Symmetry: C3
Subunit: 335 residues, 3 copies
């Protein structure tokens, strides 16, 4: 009822840039609330590889992917989206978690210098993709980095196939991005004055259905080296993954997905003991894993060409004690 929706507690949340996630509780604290978020849209040039390749990013909250928003089932997510007058394009937002008006895209078309406030009831539990979708140029905005994901946790937290609770110690959000950067006759990636200048050349690359780069956190190596995600032997980690436009097949090298909500929806029992899962373009998925061995792990899109030639590889730096029962080198490489 009206009075009841109006009486719900309102709560503002401070977002954090991916792969990190803002503060939240797995099990809902209190009753349904209208969770408030605010994101400013930034159109800016970003370098995506070691060769200085640029992309005119269209980023929610200034990041590629946009930040992860976490709410519980039946809460209302109320987002204030701002498109500064400094931008040159109209933007909007489609929450795959939302029901109605094309996910909210039909109610949030804001030109540079405008803002809007959209509220929707998170009626279904799971991880969902959210992305910009201006009619007539939906792919262009999405493949320019304008997408993220939200997590709608069941009020009672996560559980496995037989109702046993699954509580993670850590949670990371890996947004995978397929980029389509134009090249000149010589094969060098092109640079442009403004976003629109690249429109035509970019759509041509997009039609080949072959991305020039497939990256995590907006750039080749963004989640490797000193920016590797961390964990410890014995820790339970939830890795949320999304791809707003193209299929992906996540894999923890040296590990597994103990429980994987491959479709991303919590009412659908998770698959177990996964080596490699699949997330279709336009969806988010989530894998729960308890680390057992220390060392550096790689987390990749398992088409290894996309992982190691195109950029779809991240790292996990795990501390702890090695387990010789699980694995041991009986005879080290020798003549």
């Amino acid at each position: 009822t009206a009075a009841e929706i109006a009486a719900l507690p309102r709560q503002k949340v401070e977002l954090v840039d991916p792969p990190f996630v803002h503060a939240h509780s797995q099990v809902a604290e209190g009753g349904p609330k209208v969770v408030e978020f605010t994101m400013v849209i930034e159109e800016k040039k970003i370098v995506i590889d070691d060769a200085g390749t640029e992309v005119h990013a269209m980023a929610f909250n200034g990041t590629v992917p946009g930040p992860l928003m976490v709410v519980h089932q039946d809460d209302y997510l109320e987002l204030t989206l701002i498109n500064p007058e400094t931008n040159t394009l109209m933007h909007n937002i489609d929450f795959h978690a939302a029901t109605g008006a094309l996910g909210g895209g039909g109610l949030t078309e804001i030109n540079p210098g405008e803002k809007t406030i959209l509220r929707f009831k998170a009626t279904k539990p799971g991880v969902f993709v959210y992305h910009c979708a201006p009619p007539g140029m939906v792919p262009w905005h999405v493949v320019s980095g304008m997408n993220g994901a939200i997590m709608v946790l069941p009020r009672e937290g996560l559980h496995d196939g037989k109702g046993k609770a699954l509580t993670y110690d850590k949670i990371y959000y890996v947004g995978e991005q397929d980029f389509y950067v134009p090249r000149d006759e010589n094969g060098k990636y092109k640079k442009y004055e403004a976003p629109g200048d690249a429109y035509e050349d970019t759509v041509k690359v997009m039609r080949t259905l072959t991305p020039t780069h497939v990256v995590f956190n907006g750039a080749v190596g963004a989640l490797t080296g000193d920016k590797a995600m961390t964990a410890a032997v014995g820790e339970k980690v939830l890795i949320v993954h999304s791809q707003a436009n193209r299929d992906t097949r996540p894999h923890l090298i040296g590990g597994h997905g103990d429980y994987v909500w491959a479709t991303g929806k919590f009412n659908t029992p998770p698959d177990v003991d996964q080596e490699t899962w699949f997330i279709p373009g336009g969806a988010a998925g989530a894998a729960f894993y308890t680390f057992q061995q220390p060392g550096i792990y790689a987390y990749v899109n398992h088409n290894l060409i996309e992982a190691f030639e195109l950029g779809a590889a991240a790292h996990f730096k795990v501390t702890g004690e090695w387990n010789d029962d699980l694995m041991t080198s009986v005879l080290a490489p020798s003549g």
Copy 2:
């Protein structure tokens, strides 16, 4: 069962309807096993697949791309009379993925132009299945020329969710998705050919790129839009059967969900629930059940947005009814 016992089975002739509509049927089976009879004439015809007038020499079952949806119940016998007209220039056959034996029926149905055949198979497994032409050595060319459709073998007790609760749809639509490989001239313009044959070698070359020039619903870009947009109402339960005989797809109802989705298309496999975007592998059909909650226009797409909005894989749903502000509301309309 003996041909005699099967012959003692009641027979019922069905009049097919063109996709996305489905011929009249009952969700729960009417009595016991029957021999459901269907007839389809194969038509090799030029079709236009986009607003620019791009043409394809289609190979269409019942004259449509996709071929029509045949609906029977588990343990019924599907008896198809397939006709290949004298006017056609190629041999055609049919492989029902729902069938068991002779390459899905393909090895027993090779008919040359001017020939016909009658195949009968027992629909032993419940679910939606793809059917398509498969002439040895020319299989992909016939399939990506539009020679494919789907059938639905309903459980005799109708649909049920993963927990046994009955799932009864008010309406049903069949969306056949087609990947086309159209050759282009040195200017990037699509080529036209006098006879389908003159297109073969050029088309095989494009097919090898594994990159379709068009990915469409019901044979053409925008085919299920405007006055051909599908319809529903707030509160209406709709089953959307989707098939792709040669290539993967990932259906998504923009602004909606797939409340229950048999992503593998098989009814004995519990449906996934609350789906945002599902996946149907090339060579299969899937089905999504959804109860509309909001009025307005919805786009139904293959969620590789480039395929959807650049290649042609987008349909529309016009939904009547009252807006639900509880589910969604514009607190502050776009403003300064």
Copy 3:
């Protein structure tokens, strides 16, 4: 503890070339054991099509794909991997079934002239991919056919979703491979005198993400004729299928996948009555089917262009009586 594993019975297994699988028991015979395997790596030219197209294969045990290793859950798989001095590249092995050191790859880097022995506990039941992964040359080795699979059977054998036992009469292993063969400017496939000579050219083809060939058992038509798989009406067959780098969609033409562990993990209930299943690049899946009709069946990757233009098609020669109740030609093709 080491002492305990040391006290475990050990068994040397003899490997056989795909699509056949070495002798094993569906239900485990006895308590956990350390199952030993040995594989020598062979860099060799293989002819992949009737046009004489060659690939510089990097084959475990001399075949593409490498042989299927079968152990039971909680057994230890101990592999002695050998890289002969006749080879030119360093190789290693990642068992997706293993936990730690990048699936074993970090512990098995052997140069030509070296060997190593790796032992891991097969803690999760299902079929898993294994493949070479030299840092910086991962996809290249994998798409050169250096991959295979293992099956970790539950101690009590296979079961359906409701716990009823599923015992197969025959088992086959189909390893699907995506090759990227360079062509001279005339469209003719190029031939080389050494693996490294093809590197630069091959990487370029790989980046298009478009394979020139997609084959089963290393060559177009490999699993046909003298190598057509066999079964008899009434026989229950398990078809294990793997693809270490790219997606696939298996389909038994004229048949079905009665039970399909699509993710390849036995603890994830199998899908049933499948027409076409999906296996993501970087995984293995398994389908159980009881043949009901005699005749030649084709088994394919259901992107028909990949199956019939690119090479992804195998045959099954089945003996038995035709069942007219299941299918019958009421009127044979006629006027």
